[PDB]
């Protein structure tokens, strides 16, 4: 058996329990990573800085 997902869920739950002002910036980073991984390709062209 494997239980990595349960461990990650427990980590996220314990993070939500220990709520601070800086949880929102981490949630924003996570959702941005998910969004970029989900679509990507479409709106990336030129602009090596981007």
């Amino acid at each position: 058996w494997d239980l990595t997902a349960f461990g990650l869920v427990a980590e996220w739950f314990l993070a939500y329990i220990l709520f601070t002002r800086f949880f929102y910036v981490l949630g924003l980073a996570a959702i941005m990573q998910l969004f970029f991984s989900y679509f990507a390709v479409h709106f990336i062209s030129n602009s090596w800085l981007m």
């Binding site: 959702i31 969004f35 989900y38 679509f39 479409h42 709106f43």
Partner: protein
Amino acid sequence: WLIINLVQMAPISAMVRMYIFFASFYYVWKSYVHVVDGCNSSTCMMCYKRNRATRVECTTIVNGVRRSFYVYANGGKGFCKLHNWNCVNCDTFCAGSTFISDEVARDLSLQFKRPINPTDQSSYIVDSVTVKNGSIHLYFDKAGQKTYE
């Protein structure tokens, strides 16, 4: 030129899918907020509030002692528009039935913060008595009509 570049950034389908993603996330966040903290419309009782239970406790003053009693309900199944209460078989008298009178109707309306309609008067006056076959008949007037038991 900036506007032209912005509008031609991605095809329409990608824009629709990206809008759907953000809309779904926003609605999930709003649902999560609505689950924990409670909604503004407490009058409708929504689902986060009680008072849907079967029994309701009230008190009344008699002679020199204060006595308590229960008021029954359906538990959530169904609603009566005429009486504005979760009544069960209120048209018949039996164990477990519900009965609301003006002496308790006002207190219950104050407790529930909404008006309710009483079903019948608390008491009536008998005017004639007839005895037949070892049984006694009591006659009284109800809403201008003759009744007996």
